[PDB]
Amino acid sequence: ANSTNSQSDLDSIQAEITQRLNEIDRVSGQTQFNGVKVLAQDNTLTIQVG
């Protein structure tokens, strides 16, 4: 939000933000457990504890 930034600097900031978002989607899709993915959707799971 600095009005002092020149537009090239803003473009640099946008680059960094884009790379962060890329990593976020990587984490979302690619994490797994036992071979099954965990977070690539809204999910619902019951464990049998009795």
Add this chain to the structure above:
Amino acid sequence: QAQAQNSQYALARTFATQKVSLEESVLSQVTTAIQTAQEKIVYAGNGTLSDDD
């Protein structure tokens, strides 16, 4: 005559015991098998299993 009755029931008891014991054996093993199948069912309840596992 009385003795004859007693002897015949001795024999009958012999064969009854034969069959009874033979049943009990496999029955105990049946209990075992039911219990193991139970345990692996409870593992089917595991909510982390993948379809291939």
